[PDB]
Design a protein around this nucleic acid. Structure first.
Length: 188
DNA sequence: AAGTTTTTGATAAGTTT
DNA sequence: AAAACTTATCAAAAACTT
């Protein structure tokens, strides 16, 4: 019984989603913009607040919409959470009551596969690029010639809280050998 | 742009002469 | 034995790739 509208960037395809619900017999308007960084609902972010947690929702173009990347499915599954579903017209996407709900409930929950295998496709251009031509991981800032260097420092007269200063390693790295000073258990 | 695989690093898990 | 101290968990990372 609600109502929402999406903007792309031009006022050309705005009236397409605007008065698109002009007869949708809604009750509330929710215009917004994307001009900024669409990484934080750059428009009408409180529509989910003052919403009828009991009755259905309203929005129509899942096309031009914030709906993006892997997350577009992650949190959108909050409809089934409260008391709504969907049922626009531009895309008569089967929804509304259980007719669509439990018919497009395994379309967003099973939507895994839609890209769940891209977990392999993506690993293709990587598991291959690997082989012997560039692994693809944090580049070592410490050189092998400078690693074994301390192989005889603190073995002739060098302490601990001093061996590392010109190197400036870390606050957990350094020690990667035999014991040092009593007591155990990590944390970093 | 959703990933790895290495090789990394400031905060939180831990005693007894 | 209280917190010194060397740990083995937790992000961000610079390298890269679908």
């Amino acid at each position: 019984l609600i109502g929402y509208v999406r903007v792309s960037t031009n006022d050309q395809n705005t009236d397409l989603q605007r008065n698109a619900l002009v007869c949708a017999g809604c009750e509330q308007i929710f215009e917004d913009k994307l001009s900024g960084t669409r990484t934080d609902r750059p428009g009408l972010k409180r529509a989910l607040k003052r919403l009828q947690k009991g009755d259905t929702l309203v929005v129509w173009k899942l096309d031009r919409l914030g709906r993006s990347m892997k997350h577009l499915i992650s949190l959108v599954g909050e409809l089934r959470e409260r008391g709504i579903n969907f049922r626009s017209l531009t895309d008569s996407i089967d929804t509304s009551s259980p007719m669509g709900r439990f018919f497009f409930h395994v379309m967003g929950a099973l939507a895994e596969v839609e890209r769940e295998l891209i977990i392999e496709r993506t690993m293709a251009g990587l598991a291959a690029a690997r082989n012997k031509g560039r692994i693809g991981g944090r580049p070592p800032k410490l050189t092998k010639a400078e690693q074994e260097q301390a192989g005889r420092l603190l073995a002739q007269g060098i302490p601990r809280k001093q061996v590392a200063l010109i190197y400036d390693v870390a606050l957990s790295t350094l020690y990667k050998k035999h014991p040092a000073k009593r007591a155990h258990i990590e944390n970093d």
